[PDB]
Amino acid sequence: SHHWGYGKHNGPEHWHKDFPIAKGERQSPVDIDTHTAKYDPSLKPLSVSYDQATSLRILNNGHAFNVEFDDSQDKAVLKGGPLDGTYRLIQFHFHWGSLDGQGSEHTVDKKKYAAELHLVHWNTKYGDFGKAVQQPDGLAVLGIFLKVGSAKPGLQKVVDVLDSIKTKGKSADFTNFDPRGLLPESLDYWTYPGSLTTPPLLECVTWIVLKEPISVSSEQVLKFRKLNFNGEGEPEELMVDNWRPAQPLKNRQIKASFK
Ligand SMILES: NS(=O)(=O)c1ccc(NC(=O)CN2C(=O)NC3(CCCC3)C2=O)cc1
Ligand SMILES: NS(=O)(=O)c1ccc(NC(=O)CN2C(=O)NC3(CCCC3)C2=O)cc1
Ligand SMILES: [Zn+2]
């Protein structure tokens, strides 16, 4: 069974033994060299359409927490930019650090942010998420950096439910949450072809990483760091540093949406 994690004995440097694609040609995350990334005029306007998003549940899966959506219809979709066709929102989650100076998966000129939000979408031409992850253009993940400063009001409903999902396998109702409250003002982005950043590390993702970080308060991210990797009644292992470091760019170009 899956025994991967983020510790010294099961962390990113071990994953390749059970998931050899860990050393593949389009792995994520990567460092975004802002000087090398080139403006691409072929990129179409990005369309984030979350007006009808229907959140259902929040789950501690032992690696992060997922806010899950009803993806049984096109209620919340991502289109445009580098994408051909329609990608349906299925879940979002975060990666974060033990300290404000680390936590993001992508880096910007080697800068690590305190955390990174991943809004995960699947290409509806493949019918279901399980089929989509077997395709090179199966998923689109919208990545948003978090820095510590002023509170993000749209995050507080997430922060306040974390006490109820402290341990692995716990879930709670999480209806009527509007993910539009987690976006920054600008949709300027970088894009490149990559992978899931956790096992099974499938090379099925078009990454769209927003340039503008959101600000969250120290108090908000400190509540992320009170979650547990362990299950109920097990020795406490704080859920911190659940990020994979930058992987080799190999034969890839990062494109910028902005001049
Ligand atoms: N290539 S990999 O997927 O990263 C990878 C890395 C390590 C391991 N095996 C491990 O050492 C980790 N493992 C244990 O030995 N015992 C537990 C703790 C209690 C439940 C199971 C655990 O987590 C398996 C796969
Ligand atoms: N950090 S990341 O790259 O954004 C990223 C995003 C997603 C994932 N993995 C998944 O969503 C894993 N997974 C499946 O394969 N099947 C389900 C259960 C049934 C449908 C969805 C599931 O949860 C891993 C990393
Ligand atoms: Zn992620």
DSSP string, 77-89: EEEETT--S-EEE
Strand-pairing partners, residue 256, are: 39, 190
Q: Is 206 in the pocket of ligand 2 (CB under 6 A)?
A: no
HSE-up of residue 29 (Cα within 13 Å, Cβ side): 28
Query: Strand, coil or helix: what is 23?
Result: helix
Triad 222, 60, 148: Cα angle to 5°: 25
Strand-pairing partners, residue 117, are 94, 144
Residues 26 and 20 sit within 8 Å (Cβ to Cβ): no
Residue type, 255: K
| Residues pairing with 186 in the sheet | none
φ, ψ (nearest 5 deg) of residue 199: -50, 140
- Helix ranges, 102-191 (H): 129-132, 156-161
CA of 35 to the centre of ligand 2 (A): 32
Tokens (6 digits) for 77: 């979709």
**Is the Cβ atom of 15 under 6 angstroms away from ligand 1?**
yes
Find out whether the beta carbon of 4 lies less than 6 Å from any atom of ligand 1. Answer: yes
Q: Are 159 and 52 in contact (CB under 8 A)?
A: no
Q: Which two tokens stand for residue 246?
A: 């930058």
If you take atom 17 of ligand 1, which residue's CA is the nearest one?
3
Distance CA 110, CA 87 (A): 30
Cβ of 133 below 6 Å from ligand 2: yes
C-alpha dihedral sign at 46, 54, 114, 241: negative
The structure tokens listed for 125 are: 């031409």
Residue 118 assigned to a binding site: yes
Resolution of the entry in angstroms: 1.3
Sorted by sequence, the CB contacts under 8 Å of residue 234 that are 6+ apart come out as 167
Return the sign of the alpha-carbon dihedral for residues 29, 34, 40, 44: positive
Tell me phi and psi for residue 94, to 5 degrees.
-130, 160
Are β-strands 38-39 and 255-256 bridged in parallel, bridged antiparallel, or unpaired? Answer: parallel
| Residue 35 marked ligand-binding | no
Q: What's the Cα-to-Cα distance from 134 to each of 25, 40, 126, 203, rounded to whole Å? A: 16, 27, 9, 8
Distance CA 230, CA 225 (A): 13
**Which residues, chain by chain, have CB under 5 Å from ion ligand 3?**
118
| Residues 101 and 244: beta-carbon distance below 8 Å | no
> E strands along the chain, which residues?
31-32, 38-39, 46-49, 55-60, 65-69, 77-80, 87-96, 107-108, 115-123, 139-148, 171-173, 189-194, 205-210, 214-216, 255-256
DSSP β-bridge partners for residue 57:
68, 173
Distance 4 CA to ligand 1 centre (A): 6
Q: Measure Cα distances from 89 to 34, 75, 76, 188, 237 in Å.
A: 28, 8, 6, 20, 30
Distance (Å, whole) CA 218 – CA 232: 26
Torsion of CA 80, 203, 174, 128, to 10 degrees: 80
Give the catalytic positions in this structure: 63
Residue 66 CB–ligand 2 contact under 6 Å? no
Nearest ligand 1 atom, CA 16? 1
Closest residue (by CA) to atom 3 of ligand 2? 196
**CA angle at residue 5 from 25 to 16, to 5 degrees?**
30
Residue in the block written with tokens 């990174």: 116
Q: What is the DSSP letter of 75?
A: S
Q: Angle 28-195-255 (CA atoms, 0-180°, nearest 5)? A: 65
- Dihedral sign of CA atoms 218, 223, 224, 226 in order: positive
Q: Which atom of ligand 1 is nearest to the CA of 199?
A: 3
Instruction: Tell me if 36 is assigned to a ligand binding site.
Output: no
CA separation, residue 129 to residues 104, 135, 248 (Å): 25, 10, 26
Give the list of residues 6+ apart from residue 150 with CB closer than 8 angstroms, or none. 215, 217
Tell me the CA–centroid distance for residue 5 and ligand 1, in Å. Answer: 8
The answer to whether residues 92 and 182 touch, using CB atoms and an 8 Å cutoff, is: yes
**Which among 10, 120, 112, 17 is positioned nearest to 66, based on CA atoms?**
120
3-state class percentages of the chain: helix first, strand second, coil last, to nearest 5: 15, 30, 55
- CA–centroid distance, 110 to ligand 1, in Å, is 30
Residue ID of nearest Cα to ligand 1 atom 13: 3
